[PDB]
Amino acid sequence: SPSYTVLGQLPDTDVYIDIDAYEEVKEIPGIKIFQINAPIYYANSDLYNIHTVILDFTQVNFMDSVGVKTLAGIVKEYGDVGIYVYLAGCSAQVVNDLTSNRFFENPALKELLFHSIHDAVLGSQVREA
Ligand SMILES: [Cl-]
Numbered sequence: 001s002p003s004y005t006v007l008g009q010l011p012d013t014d015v016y017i018d019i020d021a022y023e024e025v026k027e028i029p030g031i032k033i034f035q036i037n038a039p040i041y042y043a044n045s046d047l048y049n050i051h052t053v054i055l056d057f058t059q060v061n062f063m064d065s066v067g068v069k070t071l072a073g074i075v076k077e078y079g080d081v082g083i084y085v086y087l088a089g090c091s092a093q094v095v096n097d098l099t100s101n102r103f104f105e106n107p108a109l110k111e112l113l114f115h116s117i118h119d120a121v122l123g124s125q126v127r128e129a
């Protein structure tokens with residue numbers, strides 16, 4: 001798909017890349033890592049034993065209201081079955097867009113933000129169930 005890319009980990013590193021870019025790259029059991037390559041409502045359309053979903057926002061330069069609403073729905077619906085959706089690599093601007101569109105109306109959602117994919121992976125290691 002062009003709207004998202006499944007990422008895996010280069011073994012024994014904090015390097016995460018396209019699962020298809022190199023043979024030894026492997027997904028992490030219990031975690032799904034998706035790189036957003038288009039506005040999330042496009043990638044979400046494709047979405048339509050995992051404990052964590054990590055969304056890599058490194059390619060995202062801004063978000064619009066529809067996208068934030070879509071993301072809020074993804075986070076809520078996964079959360080309602082105990083699955084955490086983490087946001088990795090959001091720029092200051094993207095976080096401003098999330099905030100402006102009231103994504104953090106519940107300030108607890110701030111806890112879903114991580115600087116890097118690896119940080120997000122480590123964040124999932126131990127947490128309130
Ligand atoms: Cl968006």
Ligand SMILES: [Cl-]
Nearest residue numbers: 089116117118
């Ligand atoms: Cl990263």
